[PDB]
Amino acid sequence: DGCCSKMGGINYCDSSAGRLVCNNGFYSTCYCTRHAVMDLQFLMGCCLWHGGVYPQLNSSGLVVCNDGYVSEECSLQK
């Protein structure tokens, strides 16, 4: 987590750029804000590319997305 290692250290965060500036004029591999252009390829969650988790609760453990589609991927079984 030591980002500006072997340098002068952290100067501040260019929050427009989303990266901490080292004390020499370069950008760290780390980021400060969540508004940062990073690579995102894999993520968690159920009912993806659908309506999401419906706010209702069921007698069974069946989970149906809000778009009308039913998901068996995270649903339980016998």
Binding site: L57, N58, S59, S60, G61, L76
Partner: protein, 165 residues
């Protein structure tokens, strides 16, 4: 629709001393009902060789309904009705108090009786008079039973009595 007299599981998570009966809840951990909770109570037997939880207040999620199927308990993987707890809580304490009060009474009376055929006299004095009131008070308080206590980390098995829809 539940068959009459089949066995399901539940897990008891909180413990209570058997002096104040009350609503005790378990979570039903197997079967068609999942996420369901259930409150009931116990009763104190005269001989403590078994202890059961009557279980009637059944709450099932999904819809806000409260069915009232009443059932009893058996020990899972044991299939017996006893409680796995201690039963010798308050025998030896009252035994010792009574016997000490007795020994005081006997010391005073007998070693006053042996006077015919200072400090020894005062020993006779002290045990002679402090045996009596303590002895009748020991027989006064001797009647408290040995409490049992269900545990917070052992489940129970619930066997059905009637049908529900």
């Amino acid at each position: 629709i539940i068959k009459t007299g089949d066995i399901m599981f539940a897990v008891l998570d909180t413990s209570v001393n058997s002096d104040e009966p009350g609503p005790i809840l378990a979570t039903i951990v197997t079967g068609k009902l999942k996420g369901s909770k259930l409150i009931g109570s116990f009763n104190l037997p005269s001989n403590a060789d078994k202890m059961v939880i009557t279980f009637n207040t059944m709450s099932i999620p999904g819809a806000e309904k409260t069915i009232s199927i009443s059932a009893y308990a058996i020990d899972p993987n044991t299939a017996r009705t006893a409680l796995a707890s201690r039963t010798n809580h308050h025998y030896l304490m009252r035994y010792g108090s009574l016997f000490a009060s007795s020994f005081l009474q006997g010391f005073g009376n007998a070693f006053q009786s042996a006077n015919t055929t200072s400090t020894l006299e005062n020993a006779v004095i002290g045990l002679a008079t402090v045996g009596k009131a303590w002895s009748q008070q020991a027989q006064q308080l001797f009647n408290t039973p040995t409490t049992v206590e269900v545990y917070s980390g052992t489940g129970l098995g619930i066997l059905f009595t009637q049908d529900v829809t």
